[PDB]
């Protein structure tokens, strides 16, 4: 059940891809650590909730 993922390596030693290993020890998912590999989304539903969405170089009002 060992899960192996890659580290986003910031400062590199003078020595490529480095990994880390994870194993869940408990049956309940609430017991689990945070994976922190998170997906991002569009701001659109807040920044542009328009019914007719318009392209920025055209007149906003027409």
């Amino acid at each position: 059940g060992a899960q192996v993922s890659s580290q986003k390596v910031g400062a590199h030693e003078n020595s490529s891809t480095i990994n880390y290993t994870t194993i869940n020890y408990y049956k309940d998912s609430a017991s689990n650590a945070a994976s922190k590999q998170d997906y991002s989304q569009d701001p659109s539903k807040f920044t542009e909730p328009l019914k007719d969405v318009l392209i920025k170089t055209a007149p906003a009002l027409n």
């Binding site: 059940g1 060992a2 899960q3 192996v4 993922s5 890659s6």
Partner: peptide, 4 residues
């Protein structure tokens, strides 16, 4: 194992 499960390597992503």
């Amino acid at each position: 194992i499960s390597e992503v």
